[PDB]
Structure 1
Amino acid sequence: VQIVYKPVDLSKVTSKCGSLGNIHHKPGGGQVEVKSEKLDFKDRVQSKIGSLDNITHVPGGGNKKIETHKLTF
């Protein structure tokens, strides 16, 4: 068996921006209550229990490229 894998990639993900400007993120805080008894978990688990988060994310370009290659014989 002969396998040739050559996925040539010539590419760009780009952006141009003059300015981003005035960004105002001003939340009132609220209130979060979470009640549970038993938390049992495993094997690739991501969790958030009870939160009040504020995220301001202002990159000067946040261009993203995700690529995967899988060859299984």
Structure 2
Amino acid sequence: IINKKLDLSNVQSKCGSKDNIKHVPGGGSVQIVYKPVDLSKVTSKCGSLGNIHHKPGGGQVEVKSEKLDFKDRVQSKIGSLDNITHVPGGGNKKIETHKLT
């Protein structure tokens, strides 16, 4: 057996994944999650009197509120968010999340 490799690679694996994003306002509220997953390989070669301009755009997020009025009560009442029971275990009994009786 002869095993030979040149690994000159670029890898992103399982990146930026399985995020759980919740925004639950009463009112007048902004949530921004800015999560690009970017893999860039750039090999600019410039001889003689050439020019290379490499200026790809980035992400822009703009939120503008010019006027916002709430003239009466802003109220949130949350008993729960996001109840989860995972239980990959073998032989478990009476496993409970958010039990009301």
Question: How high is the TM-score relative to the length of structure 1?
Answer: 0.18
Q: For residue 22 of structure 1, what is the aligned residue in structure 2?
A: 51
Instruction: After TM superposition, give the deviation of residue 10 of structure 1 in Å.
Output: 0.4
Tell me: CA distance 1:30–1:71, structure 2 relative to 1, closer, same or farther (3 Å): closer
Q: How far did 1:8 drift? A: 1.6
Change (3 A) 1:3 1:33: closer
Structure 2 spans left out of the alignment, 5+ residues? 1-29
Distance apart, 1:6 and its partner CA: 0.9
- Name whichever of 51-60 and 17-26 sits farther off: 51-60
More strand by share: 1
CA displacement 1:36-58 (0-9 Å, x = unmatched): 99999999999999999999999
How much identity, in percent, do the aligned residues show?
100
Aligned counterparts of 2:90 and 2:50: Cα–Cα separation in 1: 13
The partner residue of 2:63 within 2, 17, 34 is 34
Instruction: Tell me whether 46-55 or 26-35 shows the greater mean CA deviation.
Output: 46-55
Instruction: State the 4+ residue runs in structure 1 displaced beyond 6 angstroms.
Output: 16-72
Give 1 or 2 for the bigger CA radius of gyration. 2
Q: 1:45 and 1:62, CA in 2 relative to 1: closer, same or farther beyond 3 A?
A: farther
Instruction: Give the superposed CA RMSD.
Output: 23.9
Listed one character per residue, the Cα deviations across residues 10-42 of structure 1 (whole Å, up to 9, x for unaligned) are 010026899999999999999999999999999
